[PDB]
Design brief:
Chains A, B: It comes from Homo sapiens. The structure is a homodimer of 827-residue chains. Helix content of chain A is 54%, strand content 9%. With 827 residues, chain A is α+β, with helices and mostly antiparallel strands. At the A-B interface, helix 2, helix 4, helix 6, helix 7 and helix 11 of A face helix 2, helix 4, helix 6, helix 7 and helix 11 of B.
């Protein structure tokens, strides 16, 4: 009946056909993909049903199409030798059929031919018929058709997303699995056109990308040169993966997309492993280089951080043997520049309640790369020189790394840099290779500047690294041979001139005599630029409201056109602001500001934003820490209207910091000259057998003893007094002349002998346990100068006596130093 | 006393000096900027105090420095002829003093010389001394010094941020104001080096930018060629403003930075207005072009949207006379490409609870630009041709605009495009200039493709535009002369072949006989991949929990390493999912997911992410609307851990959509061929005097009447039946032959005479009010064909009679058509 009703296709009574198709559908379904709807004569009727599907125009209706598809599938699958797709259609028919699903003459993006239900029904019918099959195989014909469909992407005759979805659906035979061999084999031209289109494809949304990654994965599993090789060897693959990784939605792509990318890369690695894994590792390194280069995704903070971190994690497990040194060095250089920028461009505030992980993973990758042995000709990682040597010889890379570590303080990004530098030192061909960049760094100031008072930036981490490099006698001897001792001694003198001591002295003491951070908000006065706003004085109260206070202490009603509310807190006097706490109304977190822009005014008149607004939606407590404490007599909080409320509710605002003086006034290597002294102490003491040499290198430098004494008589600035004492004794004893100079510095004139050192800050002849010990050791140490030393000591005694019988050192001899001279004579 | 104590500067007893300085400070303060601390001999002591400040090294202490600064300022300001800075210091001294504040040998980024309090005290002292001044003026000397300091930026001897802060502070005399003339005049070399450094400066945080903008503003107010001209004429200014505008923090810069940018641009405009405003307008257009070009900020969705919108708003108020046509056309082209990308790359979901404003403002700018008169030589906007003409002649721009409007549906971005097109038509030199791009667009398919069934995308907005362009007789005549009637008629036939009707027909009726969107969540089964998660079935309940329910209906405890929780809802059958509602626990909005990644599965096995995760922190209700309804038998919600909680709390999840059939199964121009018919009706009816011509152009096209009849007998698809009837009568009457064909189509064979039209879908001879009216009018209209028409009518009667005495049209004559023939004979 249905056969005869359709016979005109090969006048139609569409109403009678409809009744019959519905009846036949109901009978066949009484005989899961079709729940949404709730053997030669068989070939005849199914062929006619396909013709009918192909004949449907605007006079036909999608709802009938659904049943036609359902019945077609069910009949194909009901016959003993299942009817194959190649018995049902021919090539032009199959092509038109698939174009109903994917052609741009039938589908206009959001508008699909026959609607979503028709698309779905057609797909389900094709899938059912194929599955029944999986005499003549239909796969050859599907291959022809899909290769044509892929050849049609470049001219915009086929929609990428629908083609991919369809090819995935039909080739999976139904759950996706990254190890599946597609039923429908695409040819090399298809894969190439696919990559080309993707490289230029402008509208790649996330669903499209997930389809793309799943399909690339399955393509790698096709027997086409393997497809994995074709793909990785194609320049377009890098463009495509860069587009993907370069990106109110979250920047992320979410776990499923990230895992899709991982599965793709894993499949590439696996297919290339037992043949040519070097091109895969080189592809990964080229990719990372592109992402890390200036104005690239990593540098601009673009793209799905989750996918980028996953890429780095995957890359860190790869074997980089037989990789070109050019790509390795390119990635090392881009990465070191990137991480240096990252550490130097750090935001001025921090709010918490990650890109660090990405930077750390890149530094880990660099660590892996610098350890690779080089080939004989130094062009490829091998498998006794190393990539490390090329890096050490690169002055710009080493400068960037060392200054980066110089900007770190006491595993993180700084730890990553330390690990790299430690590796570089272990892998350096010679200790000189490692020392030369260190010495270059120590010989210049900020960003390689020169100048009289310009000296390089030290940090506890960088210092620890240098000490590790200077750990062996061979390293210390080389350091000496390259003029390192003179360099650190000069740097100590210079840096001591170019810093003022921030440790409190007697001015702070006189202030205290005249009467962990502290909340100054309660002392403040709070205003709003809005004339209608509720008085916010309650926000300043030292004691917050109860964590269940049902009504926000303070509320702001936004006019429908208002994006920002402002609250300015004027303090009675400037303070060193370190943190700003904002407590939103916990009971109604929808009224929390979506973001907060902090401006600070030192003079309390000219406000300056601290940073870009911090995102605060979803936070129960907003803690904005100033990385660098700022002098502030006023703080303007600009609170952005909540995402999902017209009122802003706040409980408390705290402005935490320190006063200059009073009770509320509560990395030395980075802020003082002490790091140079710690280096000098290490050189003088670490390898006793070299002390002599080091002392002789150090003793000549002008004003070194005066500076070291100054550091000795300073409040603790990151070096325990005994080490400074040891430095002073070893230099003072390395020769008689310097011994006399040290005695004169301690007892008589301790000042330096606009860029010249001065050391005016200390009274002459002051004594401490340290100077007593030093003088005792100078007196009682037995060597050629001992006599002269005693002599000078006795001179200072009689001189003092003489002045007393009538130089602040001589008008005010320390009783302790006199007693020390007596204790020396006694011994 | 203090003078004599300091006399060694020009041995120091720093303790005695400290006591004295503190006493003197207390006496002077008993005789607001210094609250943070709580006349030739005068020149002598102040000079010595400056020497002391300059002599401070690590043996001196910052706390004393504070009082030294306070006392220095107070003494300078206490003497009758205030002591001027130039009496206190000389050039090298002043330079060192300022370098204490801004030099990189004394300041290391976060580490400042003497600490924040010392920096502040030094600044306050300089400001106080200057203010007292404002015999010899100190301004010349400050000019020298600051020009030197700016010359020192390029070699990294001066920190940009501190130099800018200091120059701003000192030149303002204290509240900042964009109309202030700086006290300290910088020279051309300074401004040039400033711009150069800024162009390359890698670490420009927001405070740096605010300083930069304030200082550029004030520089424009300096009498240096005016400084405004120097700035705008400098290529670096564009690089700098692009860096600024190209950018958990909000992408925005906040109101203060945005206003700083506006003030800067306003000052540039004002300074350049009465001299050379064309270079300023050209600068604005070059800037916008750079931001809008491919891979630029606007295109990549980067930078402070608030500042970018403010830039566009500012630009929209400028006069663009005497601007080069090259820059105008460049910006028009980049902007049209951008907005086309924007409309075509729209996200697949939408969540609400803006970049549109930016796109709309760019389209407004384009609208302003296309209206500019051209100079005689067509190289510069003038002040009777227009930029509009150049745009109309640009095929790529017109294609992009028209396809963009083709993707819009019934002021927004689409309104902006419509406004532009309307302007282009009003400004076109001739109607042909406007019609040619329309006709080109109508002659091709998607992205200019060709093909048998490929036809262009129409939309209600684009259609309205075309009708407005075809409003006059001159326009309709030209449209006819260029073959537009034949084009729209062919397009109607073709598009009708290439679409299936999605309107419900009798299959939906039979389904209903066999028994605004709907929540299918309650029918679903919900699971989590986490074995420990609480059963989430409560989330599916049709009825939400009370809006004050104190305990989340469902909660998920995140393991410390878990970023995502997942909830998969399997539905009993596929549905057309249109929306996903997620109700978080309103009482505890801290437990709301920070973001939600929706995956949908049509087969309920293979999940595909819909889009990148939607940001949901701060939302009281999460409504994710699928722009394109998707078939879904399962939905996987991946909820991201809250920003500030280890538990996720949810009240309800709804999955709203439609079933294919049943009770729950509840822009035609874009999805049908009707737009072509609305155009044909407009051509045939709008200017009665042209009807003849139009009809003669339309009547020849093959299968046109069959298609128009098909559309007539279709369910309403965006065209009321009377208009279709008018089209049919006018064509059928334009000649006797076609009249006979129309009679045969209505009474006998209505089917078309894989790309050929078919129109199989309709029984022959069916009647409606419309066909009755058409046939009546054909019969009773008096003209040459009338007789033949009656004749054919009578033929159909007797033929029918004859078949009855023994073509479905003849075996089933409509009683209504027979009666209509009788009513015709009677008249």
């Amino acid at each position: 009946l249905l056969d005869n009703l359709l016979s005109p296709l090969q006048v139609l009574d569409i109403p009678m056909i409809s009744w019959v198709v519905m009846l036949v559908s109901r009978l066949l379904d009484y005989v899961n993909q079709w729940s949404f709807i709730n053997h030669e004569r068989c070939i005849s009727v199914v062929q006619k049903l396909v013709l009918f599907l192909l004949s449907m125009d605007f006079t036909c209706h999608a709802d009938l199409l659904l049943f036609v598809c359902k019945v077609l599938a069910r009949i194909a699958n009901a016959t003993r030798p299942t009817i194959h797709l190649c018995e049902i259609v021919n090539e032009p028919q199959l092509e038109r059929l698939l174009l109903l699903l994917v052609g741009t003459d039938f589908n206009r993006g959001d508008i699909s031919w026959g609607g979503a239900w028709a698309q779905y029904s057609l797909t389900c019918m094709l899938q059912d018929i194929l599955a029944g099959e999986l005499q003549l195989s239909s796969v050859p014909m599907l291959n022809v058709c899909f290769n044509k469909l892929f050849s049609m992407l470049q001219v915009h005759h086929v929609q990428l997303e629908s083609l991919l979805q369809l090819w995935l659906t039909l080739s999976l035979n139904f759950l996706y699995n990254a190890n599946r061999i597609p039923v429908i084999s695409l040819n090399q031209a298809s894969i190439t056109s696919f990559l080309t289109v993707l490289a230029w494809y402008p509208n790649t949304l996330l669903r499209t990308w997930c389809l793309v990654l799943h399909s690339l994965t399955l393509m790698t599993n096709m027997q086409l040169e393997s497809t994995a090789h074709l793909l990785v060897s194609d320049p377009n693959l890098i463009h495509v993966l860069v587009k993907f990784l370069s990106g109110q939605h979250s920047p992320q792509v979410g776990p499923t997309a990230t895992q899709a990318m991982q599965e793709f890369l894993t499949r590439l690695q696996v297919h290339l492993s037992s043949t040519c894994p070097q091109i895969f590792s080189e592809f990964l390194l080229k990719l990372i280089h592109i992402l890390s280069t200036e104005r690239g995704a990593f540098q601009t903070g673009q793209g799905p951080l989750d996918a980028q971190v996953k890429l780095l994690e995957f890359t860190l497990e790869q074997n980089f043997e037989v990789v070109s040194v050019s790509t390795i060095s390119a990635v090392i250089e881009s990465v070191t520049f990137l991480v240096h920028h990252y550490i130097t461009c750090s935001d001025k505030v921090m709010s918490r309640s990650t890109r660090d992980q990405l930077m750390f993973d890149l530094l880990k990758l660099v660590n892996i790369l610098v350890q690779l042995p080089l080939s004989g000709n130094r062009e490829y990682s091998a498998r006794p020189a190393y990539v490390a040597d090329l890096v050490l010889a690169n002055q710009q890379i080493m400068s960037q790394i060392l200054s980066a570590l110089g900007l770190c303080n006491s595993i993180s990004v700084g730890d990553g840099l330390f690990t790299i530098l430690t590796t570089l030192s272990k892998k350096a061909s010679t200790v000189h290779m490692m020392l030369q960049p260190i010495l270059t760094y120590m010989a210049c100031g900020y960003m390689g500047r020169q100048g009289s008072l310009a000296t390089c930036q030290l940090s506890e981490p960088l210092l620890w690294f240098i000490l590790r490099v200077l750990d062996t006698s061979d390293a210390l001897k080389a350091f000496h041979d390259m003029g390192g001792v003179q360099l650190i001694c000069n740097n100590m003198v210079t840096s001591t001139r170019a810093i003022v001591n921030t440790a409190r002295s007697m001015v702070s003491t006189i202030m205290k005599f005249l009467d962990g951070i502290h909340n100054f908000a309660p002392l403040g006065t709070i205003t709003s630029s809005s004339p209608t706003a509720q008085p916010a004085e309650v926000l300043l109260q030292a004691t917050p409201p109860h964590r269940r206070a049902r009504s926000a202490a303070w509320s702001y009603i936004f006019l429908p056109e208002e994006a920002w509310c402002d609250l300015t807190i004027h303090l009675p006097a400037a303070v060193l602001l370190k943190e700003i706490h904002i407590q939103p109304h916990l009971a109604s977190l929808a009224t929390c500001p979506s973001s907060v822009s902090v401006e600070v005014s030192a003079d309390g008149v000219n406000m300056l934003p601290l940073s870009t607004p911090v995102v605060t939606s979803g936070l129960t407590y907003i803690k904005i820490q100033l990385v660098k404490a700022e002098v502030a007599s006023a703080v303007c909080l600009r609170l952005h209207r909540p995402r999902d409320a017209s009122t802003l509710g706040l409980s408390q605002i705290k402005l935490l910091g320190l006063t200059a003086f009073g009770t509320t006034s509560s990395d030395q290597v980075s802020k003082t000259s002490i790091g140079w002294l710690r280096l000098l102490h290490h050189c003088l003491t670490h390898i006793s057998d070299l002390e002599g040499m080091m002392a002789s290198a150090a003793a000549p430098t002008a004003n070194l003893l005066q500076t070291c004494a100054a550091l000795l008589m300073s409040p603790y600035c990151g070096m325990h007094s005994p080490n400074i004492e040891v430095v002073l004794v070893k230099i003072g004893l390395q020769s008689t002349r310097i011994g006399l100079k040290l005695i004169d510095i301690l007892l008589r004139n301790c000042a330096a002998s606009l860029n010249s050192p001065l050391l005016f800050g200390r009274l002459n002849g002051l004594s401490s346990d340290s100077t007593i010990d030093i003088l005792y050791q100078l007196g009682t140490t037995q060597d050629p100068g001992t006599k002269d030393r005693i002599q000078a000591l006795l001179k200072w005694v009689s001189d003092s006596a003489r002045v007393a019988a009538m130089e602040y050192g001589l008008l005010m001899p320390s009783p302790s130093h006199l007693h020390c001279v007596a204790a020396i004579l006694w011994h």
